Amino acid sequence: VGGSDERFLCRSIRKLVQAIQIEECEGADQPCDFAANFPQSYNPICKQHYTQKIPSCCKCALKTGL
Amino acid sequence: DERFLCRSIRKLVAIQIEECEGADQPCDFAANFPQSYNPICKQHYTQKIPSCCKCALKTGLEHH
Amino acid sequence: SFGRDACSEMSIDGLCQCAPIMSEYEIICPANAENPTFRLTIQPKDYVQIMCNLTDTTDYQQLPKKLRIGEVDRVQMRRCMLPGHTPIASILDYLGIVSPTTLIFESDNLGMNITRQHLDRLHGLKRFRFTTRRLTHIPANLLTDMRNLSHLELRANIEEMPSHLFDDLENLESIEFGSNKLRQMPRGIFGKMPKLKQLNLWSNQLHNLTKHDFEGATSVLGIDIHDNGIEQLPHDVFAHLTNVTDINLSANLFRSLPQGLFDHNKHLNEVRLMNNRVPLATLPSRLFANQPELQILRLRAELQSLPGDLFEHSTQITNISLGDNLLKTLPATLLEHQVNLLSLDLSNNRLTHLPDSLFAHTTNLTDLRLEDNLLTGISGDIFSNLGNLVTLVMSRNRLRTIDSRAFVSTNGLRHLHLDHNDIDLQQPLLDIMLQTQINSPFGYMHGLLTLNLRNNSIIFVYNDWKNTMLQLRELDLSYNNISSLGYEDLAFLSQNRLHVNMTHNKIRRIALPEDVNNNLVHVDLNDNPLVCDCTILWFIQLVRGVHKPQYSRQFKLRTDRLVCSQPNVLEGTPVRQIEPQTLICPLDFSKCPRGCNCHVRTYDKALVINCHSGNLTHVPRLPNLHKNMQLMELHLENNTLLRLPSANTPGYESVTSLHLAGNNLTSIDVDQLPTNLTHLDISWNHLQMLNATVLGFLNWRSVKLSGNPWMCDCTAKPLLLFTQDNFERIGDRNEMMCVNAPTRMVELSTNDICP
Numbered sequence: 001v002g003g004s005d006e007r008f009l010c011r012s013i014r015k016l017v018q019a020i021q022i023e024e025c026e027g028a029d030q031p032c033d034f035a036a037n038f039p040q041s042y043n044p045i046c047k048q049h050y051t052q053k054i055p056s057c058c059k060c061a062l063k064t065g066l
Numbered sequence: 067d068e069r070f071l072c073r074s075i076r077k078l079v080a081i082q083i084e085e086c087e088g089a090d091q092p093c094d095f096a097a098n099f100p101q102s103y104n105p106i107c108k109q110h111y112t113q114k115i116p117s118c119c120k121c122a123l124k125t126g127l128e129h130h
Numbered sequence: 131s132f133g134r135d136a137c138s139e140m141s142i143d144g145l146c147q148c149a150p151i152m153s154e155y156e157i158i159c160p161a162n163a164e165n166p167t168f169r170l171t172i173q174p175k176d177y178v179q180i181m182c183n184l185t186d187t188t189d190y191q192q193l194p195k196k197l198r199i200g201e202v203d204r205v206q207m208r209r210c211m212l213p214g215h216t217p218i219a220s221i222l223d224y225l226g227i228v229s230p231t232t233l234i235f236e237s238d239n240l241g242m243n244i245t246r247q248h249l250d251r252l253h254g255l256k257r258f259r260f261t262t263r264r265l266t267h268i269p270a271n272l273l274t275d276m277r278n279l280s281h282l283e284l285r286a287n288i289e290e291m292p293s294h295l296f297d298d299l300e301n302l303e304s305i306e307f308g309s310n311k312l313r314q315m316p317r318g319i320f321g322k323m324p325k326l327k328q329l330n331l332w333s334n335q336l337h338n339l340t341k342h343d344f345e346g347a348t349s350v351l352g353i354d355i356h357d358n359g360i361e362q363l364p365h366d367v368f369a370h371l372t373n374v375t376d377i378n379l380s381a382n383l384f385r386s387l388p389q390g391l392f393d394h395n396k397h398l399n400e401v402r403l404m405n406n407r408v409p410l411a412t413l414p415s416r417l418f419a420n421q422p423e424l425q426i427l428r429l430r431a432e433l434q435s436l437p438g439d440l441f442e443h444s445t446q447i448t449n450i451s452l453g454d455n456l457l458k459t460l461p462a463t464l465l466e467h468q469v470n471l472l473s474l475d476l477s478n479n480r481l482t483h484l485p486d487s488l489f490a491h492t493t494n495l496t497d498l499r500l501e502d503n504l505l506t507g508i509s510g511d512i513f514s515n516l517g518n519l520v521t522l523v524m525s526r527n528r529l530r531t532i533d534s535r536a537f538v539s540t541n542g543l544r545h546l547h548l549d550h551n552d553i554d555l556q557q558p559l560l561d562i563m564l565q566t567q568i569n570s571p572f573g574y575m576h577g578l579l580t581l582n583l584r585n586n587s588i589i590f591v592y593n594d595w596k597n598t599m600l601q602l603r604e605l606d607l608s609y610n611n612i613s614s615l616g617y618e619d620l621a622f623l624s625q626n627r628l629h630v631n632m633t634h635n636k637i638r639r640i641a642l643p644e645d646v647n648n649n650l651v652h653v654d655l656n657d658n659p660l661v662c663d664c665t666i667l668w669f670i671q672l673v674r675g676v677h678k679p680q681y682s683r684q685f686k687l688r689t690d691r692l693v694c695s696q697p698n699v700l701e702g703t704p705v706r707q708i709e710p711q712t713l714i715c716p717l718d719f720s721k722c723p724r725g726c727n728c729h730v731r732t733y734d735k736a737l738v739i740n741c742h743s744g745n746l747t748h749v750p751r752l753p754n755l756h757k758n759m760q761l762m763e764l765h766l767e768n769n770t771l772l773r774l775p776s777a778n779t780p781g782y783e784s785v786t787s788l789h790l791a792g793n794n795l796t797s798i799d800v801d802q803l804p805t806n807l808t809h810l811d812i813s814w815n816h817l818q819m820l821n822a823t824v825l826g827f828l829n830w831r832s833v834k835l836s837g838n839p840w841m842c843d844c845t846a847k848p849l850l851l852f853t854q855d856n857f858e859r860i861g862d863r864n865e866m867m868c869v870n871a872p873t874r875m876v877e878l879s880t881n882d883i884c885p
């Protein structure tokens with residue numbers, strides 16, 4: 001219904017650049033939002049992801065095992 | 067070495083894609099986010115190609 | 131309102147350009163800009179995003195004109211400047227935006243502090259968010275008359291909020307003040323917000339919370355104060371939160387918590403104390419006891435031990451995460467009341483043992499995580515009441531023994547992970563060789579789906595895995611110690627797409643028999659140290675085309691990376707590429723003649739005797755031919771043989787192939803020729819003639835005759851006639867020479883030779 005909103009750990013800008021759309025991290029190496037309850041060693045950081053190279057989204061990377 | 071919140075499989079269809087292994091299901095580390103946020107893995111698309119799998123923290127007006 | 135038509139139209143009279151994309155529209159202003167002042171994303175009825183790149187408040191002049199967006203739920207404005215002494219509603223009016231429910235204003239380019247005027251005409255909003263990283267000041271009259279707001283979020287490094295900010299927020303249900311600089315709870319605010327349910331205060335610096343801080347907060351259902359650098363809490367801090375159901379205390383600095391911290395909070399449903407930033411040795415007595423509605427616990431704080439009364443009489447608990455602490459054991463009574471527990475996670479602790487009675491009452495447990503601990507055994511009692519358990523994870527422990535009755539009562543179990551342990555199932559070698567029917571401890575679980583035993587010390591494919599587990603889907607035996615396979619080891623009866631991993635074992639032989647119940651099982655045999663000798667012949671034929679017995683089609687073997695380890699000649703070459711006659715087994719010197727090497731080729735059942743010292747005058751003592759053998763090749767090339775022995779000679783009597791090229795033979799008697807002979811190479815010897823008795827013997831029998839000093843006179847007539855009618859048996863017929871001058875024998879007639 002009305003009043004909902006999705007939040008993401010990383011700020012990104014979607015834009016058009018035929019017309020190709022890309023998603024880029026709003027900043028470089030920015031710490032992730034909503035990430036104050038992870039183990040200290042996780043050091044959450046926003047990382048740029050690519051499709052093969054086109055910036056395709058911005059995601060929060062955790063330094064932990066899989 | 068790095069881990070993301072939503073598992074995804076990268077594929078080649080020649081264009082490379084990333085698809086959620088668990089779209090619309092909880093993100094990993096679901097218990098790690100602030101109260102009122104509902105962590106759900108979402109498939110995103112670019113231009114219609116699956117470009118990215120990302121953890122969305124859903125919020126709303128209704129409490130629980 | 132705004133749709134496909136308005137977007138197409140926007141080009142021709144366009145200071146701005148518009149392009150549809152998926153279900154939305156992207157508008158940029160100005161049209162030809164690399165760095166547009168405005169980029170609008172419109173999803174009709176749903177939301178409008180205004181992304182700004184402004185230097186000045188006058189830049190708003192470059193907004194699109196006559197957009198007529200219409201009714202829309204959410205307006206999100208990013209990086210925009212606060213519009214001076216003008217309401218934000220005036221920007222929205224300009225765009226024709228009608229009755230939004232939600233306004234988000236996120237910007238690091240403010241130009242000024244936010245004011246109450248900025249929200250004029252937006253008193254109808256249900257949801258408002260203001261977010262900035264600029265040094266800024268929020269005036270406490272900002273939210274005057276916002277009597278419709280149910281959800282408020284403010285993020286602006288806020289050090290304090292005067293109480294009067296909350297004067298008109300009678301409809302407020304959620305507060306999100308996470309990630310500010312709050313040091314104190316504002317006083318007397320909760321009486322202003324009698325419907326308040328969610329209080330988010332994480333990532334602040336609230337180091338002085340006391341009971342009075344929450345006076346009047348009886349409506350509050352959730353409080354989250356994670357990451358507030360909190361070292362201690364008074365025991366009565368939450369006394370007024372009588373209806374609270376969720377509490378988050380994570381990422382703080384507790385070294386202890388006081389007893390009775392939740393005594394007045396009897397509606398608790400979930401508590402999180404995760405990632406405490408210092409060691410918290412234990413939790414106080416009965417901290418989570420006597421809670422009738424408590425279901426979920428997440429506890430990670432380097433806990434060293436727990437008191438047995440921690441959850442007493444809290445019967446509704448369904449989920450406990452105790453992973454990543456320092457627990458060495460658990461008191462036996464810890465879970466005595468947890469009749470409804472579904473999931474227990476104790477992964478990543480230091481558990482050396484669990485009391486046998488620990489899971490006596492958790493009869494509803496479905497998921498049990500014990501991985502990354504130091505457990506050494508599974509006893510007959512530990513899981514005996516766990517009839518409902520579905521998956522058991524005990525990866526990366528030090529498991530060495532499994533009681534024979536450990537899994538008799540776990541009929542519900544479907545997924546069993548015991549990977550990376552020291553499990554050998556204590557199996558005697560002769561019992562295995564003598565093909566004894568031996569059930570593993572897992573044998574009771576006919577319904578099992580996953581059995582992961584990767585990286586243990588298993589040496590044998592047990593009976594129950596093949597014949598009792600008819601539903602088995604996955605059987606991981608990789609990195610174990612299996613040393614050989616027979617067809618019986620691959621006879622799995624499961625009809626549920628069984629995949630077995632036998633990679634990285636010690637598999638040196640795979641012995642499938644000659645001799646040539648309707649399932650299909652895949653088996654991965656890659657990365658094993660296979661010895662490629664005569665003993666793996668039929669396996670090799672199986673792997674390629676030739677051999678396809680009855681059993682062969684019940685399974686599908688993966689061998690694409692199964693590579694010979696031995697012998698040196700074959701080392702490195704993938705099993706499929708092997709040519710079957712290359713598979714040999716040596717015959718040792720006792721058998722094998724002194725300066726000779728001998729081997730057996732199973733592909734055609736040949737005993738091959740090679741003697742190439744180059745110095746032999748006689749045929750040495752030969753080994754007897756096994757009665758299962760058909761061919762015997764005697765290789766004596768380039769020696770100096772003076773004569774052959776008689777055909778009655780032991781060993782030599784059974785030779786089927788004589789390879790004698792390059793010797794000193796001056797005559798051949800038929801009684802020197804072995805009876806089963808089919809090939810006689812006597813080229814490059816000292817022969818002058820062949821008796822008609824030898825020629826009769828040669829009539830299949832194959833011959834080489836060139837390189838000999840043939841005497842072509844009248845006594846050679848039978849030899850001449852033999853060669854003329856035996857084009858098939860004499861490969862080097864054209865190279866035979868008569869040495870009386872030297873002339874090719876094929877150029878001689880019977881008249882030329884014999885007047």
Ligand SMILES: *[C@@H]1O[C@H](CO)[C@@H](O[C@@H]2O[C@H](CO)[C@@H](O[C@@H]3O[C@H](CO)[C@@H](O)[C@H](O[C@@H]4O[C@H](CO)[C@@H](O)[C@H](O[C@H]5O[C@H](CO)[C@@H](O)[C@H](O)[C@@H]5O)[C@@H]4O)[C@@H]3O)[C@H](O)[C@H]2NC(C)=O)[C@H](O)[C@H]1NC(C)=O
Binds near residue numbers: 087090496
């Ligand atoms: C407390 O503890 C209990 C006991 O462990 C938990 O209950 C269990 O929750 C599990 C997780 O929700 C649940 O498992 C599910 O079973 C369903 C079978 O009906 C599956 O559909 C479901 O989907 C899975 O999701 C994966 C990502 O997590 C993903 O790999 C995959 O998803 C695909 O399929 C779905 C199906 O439509 C697609 O939408 C998706 O896009 C993917 O294509 C996979 O199928 C999941 O497996 C157990 O059934 C529960 N067990 C019980 C109730 O006994 C509680 O959740 C715990 N509670 C808390 C608060 O932690």
Ligand SMILES: *[C@@H]1O[C@H](CO)[C@@H](O[C@@H]2O[C@H](CO)[C@@H](O[C@@H]3O[C@H](CO)[C@@H](O)[C@H](O)[C@@H]3O)[C@H](O)[C@H]2NC(C)=O)[C@H](O)[C@H]1NC(C)=O
Binds near residue numbers: 633
């Ligand atoms: C059984 O377990 C083994 C060991 O864990 C699994 O082996 C792994 O198999 C994958 C492919 O199935 C290998 O990855 C591939 O390697 C080749 C090498 O050039 C290349 O195409 C790619 O790099 C590709 O990723 C992997 O190396 C291999 N690992 C080991 C240690 O052997 C095997 O897959 C399992 N069998 C199953 C699941 O059926």
Ligand SMILES: *[C@@H]1O[C@H](CO)[C@@H](O[C@@H]2O[C@H](CO)[C@@H](O)[C@H](O)[C@H]2NC(C)=O)[C@H](O)[C@H]1NC(C)=O
Binds near residue numbers: 526551609
């Ligand atoms: C097989 O199991 C052993 C034991 O669990 C694994 O050895 C551990 O490996 C990790 C990672 O390198 C080390 O930190 C530990 O110290 C090792 N423990 C021991 C007892 O040696 C081993 O890696 C596993 N092998 C495979 C192929 O999975």
Ligand SMILES: *[C@@H]1O[C@H](CO)[C@@H](O[C@@H]2O[C@H](CO)[C@@H](O)[C@H](O)[C@H]2NC(C)=O)[C@H](O)[C@H]1NC(C)=O
Binds near residue numbers: 747770772793794
């Ligand atoms: C076997 O026959 C060879 C003939 O090829 C003999 O070798 C030759 O002997 C003569 C006579 O001594 C020499 O002149 C040649 O030079 C030799 N040729 C060689 C060695 O290649 C050989 O001696 C004979 N051996 C026996 C045991 O009878």
Ligand SMILES: *[C@@H]1O[C@H](CO)[C@@H](O)[C@H](O)[C@H]1NC(C)=O
Binds near residue numbers: 183
């Ligand atoms: C904003 O536009 C200016 C051009 O005036 C450009 O320098 C800058 O990079 C743009 N910033 C963003 C975030 O697009």
Ligand SMILES: *[C@@H]1O[C@H](CO)[C@@H](O)[C@H](O)[C@H]1NC(C)=O
Binds near residue numbers: 265266267
């Ligand atoms: C915001 O207000 C504070 C105090 O009222 C003032 O110190 C600061 O300069 C203002 N910020 C501006 C005008 O950007």
Ligand SMILES: *[C@@H]1O[C@H](CO)[C@@H](O)[C@H](O)[C@H]1NC(C)=O
Binds near residue numbers: 349372373
């Ligand atoms: C909130 O708690 C009080 C006890 O202080 C109780 O009387 C009231 O009924 C509770 N409200 C709800 C909705 O449970």
Ligand SMILES: *[C@@H]1O[C@H](CO)[C@@H](O)[C@H](O)[C@H]1NC(C)=O
Binds near residue numbers: 469470493494518
């Ligand atoms: C599961 O929960 C029910 C309800 O509390 C309880 O009566 C039952 O004994 C538990 N165990 C099993 C095996 O059902």
Ligand SMILES: *[C@@H]1O[C@H](CO)[C@@H](O)[C@H](O)[C@H]1NC(C)=O
Binds near residue numbers: 589
């Ligand atoms: C294979 O298992 C045996 C026990 O049967 C033991 O020596 C060891 O764990 C393994 N051997 C090697 C060489 O890794």
Ligand SMILES: *[C@@H]1O[C@H](CO)[C@@H](O)[C@H](O)[C@H]1NC(C)=O
Binds near residue numbers: 784806
């Ligand atoms: C010759 O071969 C036949 C068939 O392989 C065998 O029966 C017989 O015993 C052999 N004779 C000798 C002397 O080896």
